[PDB]
């Protein structure tokens with residue numbers, strides 16, 4: 176479970192499905208190289224994006240297409256997209272789960288690490 | 292699927308709560324919160340299968356989590372004595388409920404989800 | 409400028425919550441929640457005028473925030489029956505306490521701001 | 526009393542965060558971020574002066590609260606590099622924006638209000 180970046184809808188009381196997500200890597204030129212993207216069908220979870228060999232001991236970024244989400248449900252969010260920036264794998268391979276409790280005009284997140 | 296479960300995880304250690312005592316009750320017209328079930332937070336910080344289809348009924352419930360015991364063992368002196376999640380259930384039939392519990396020494400937050408038939 | 413300030417915010421409309429029922433209790437010697445204070449949240453979203461250091465004493469307290477009146481009168485269908493915040497108070501030094509509540513129809517958050525005046 | 530306001534609350538100490546560096550950008554026509562305003566946080570955990578209604582105009586803006594240096598000063602090991610809030614401003618008209626951010630060593634949350 177490298178990045179099981181779960182996203183939850185705090186209004187519909189269901190996982191946020193069909194929400195586009197984008198990943199980036201730390202480029203040496205202070206740029207964000209695109210890495211992966213996708214949309215879900217029924218459940219709002221992220222997986223199968225980065226493999227054990229795809230990681231680096233560096234900075235990352237996760238972008239979630241949030242404004243496009245609510246227009247479909249006819250909601251007009253204040254936020255445009257959400258970004259979490261972190262340093263990973265400093266002490267070796269660990270499994271990272273990124274929380275994301277969305278809401279129109281509000282969001283929250285949390286990080287879960289492992290010992291080995 | 293699991294009829295309902297409680298999800299709890301520490302926002303300081305970045306790990307699910309381990310050995311955080313939990314309890315459940317039932318609403319009684321005499322205001323007496325008659326105890327119904329209890330449990331201990333495992334290494335995964337989750338308790339599931341507490342209320343079966345027969346055990347659970349359409350009514351008012353409460354979930355109590357022994358937050359203060361969780362911190363003092365870690366040598367941490369928290370603010371909240373415990374937490375409570377008061378709600379209604381099965382308004383129009385049986386459903387699946389999973390609730391969140393983001394513990395921090397001086398704060399917490401909860402969130403619940405419902406899945407349509 | 410009170411030792412007990414409760415702020416309630418709407419995480420859908422993005423406005424300070426208004427017309428929200430608030431109740432304050434206190435555990436008695438018989439483990440009884442003797443009523444302490446109550447009120448309704450204004451359009452500023454800050455509840456105040458609930459207690460003073462003359463009336464505020466050491467002990468275990470409880471804070472009640474109604475939710476059904478907030479959304480059902482608004483037309484939204486909530487999940488949580490209400491919000492209950494229970495905490496020790498004035499253990500040593502009557503520090504001013506601020507209680508924060510970020511409300512969503514299916515989720516809420518609580519945080520405490522403590523400071524010695 | 527400003528159209529833009531940001532406040533950061535520390536959960537572990539339960540006190541308003543102090544000395545939290547902040548920066549504000551603007552959506553440049555070259556898809557860049559021209560720096561707009563920056564600063565740190567006081568003992569009240571709020572922002573004292575960010576943007577007047579004169580400088581505040583339409584467009585997309587980004588605000589970042591520096592947290593990595595925070596917990597190192599606190600002596601705790603963080604996780605997040607920092608927190609990024611990006612939003613569309615003045616899409617329909619003037620308003621007053623307040624940004625609230627609850628910070629914990631391994632988690633954070635945020636929300637906004639309008640006027």
Ligand SMILES: O=C(O)c1ccccc1Nc1cc(Cl)c(OOO)c(Cl)c1
Nearest residue numbers: 415417508509510519532624625627636
């Ligand atoms: O009010 C919030 O949005 C909030 C969100 C998460 C955690 C705590 C919160 N409470 C809170 C936040 C702020 Cl910024 C605040 O005042 O700012 O001038 C108050 Cl009174 C209460």
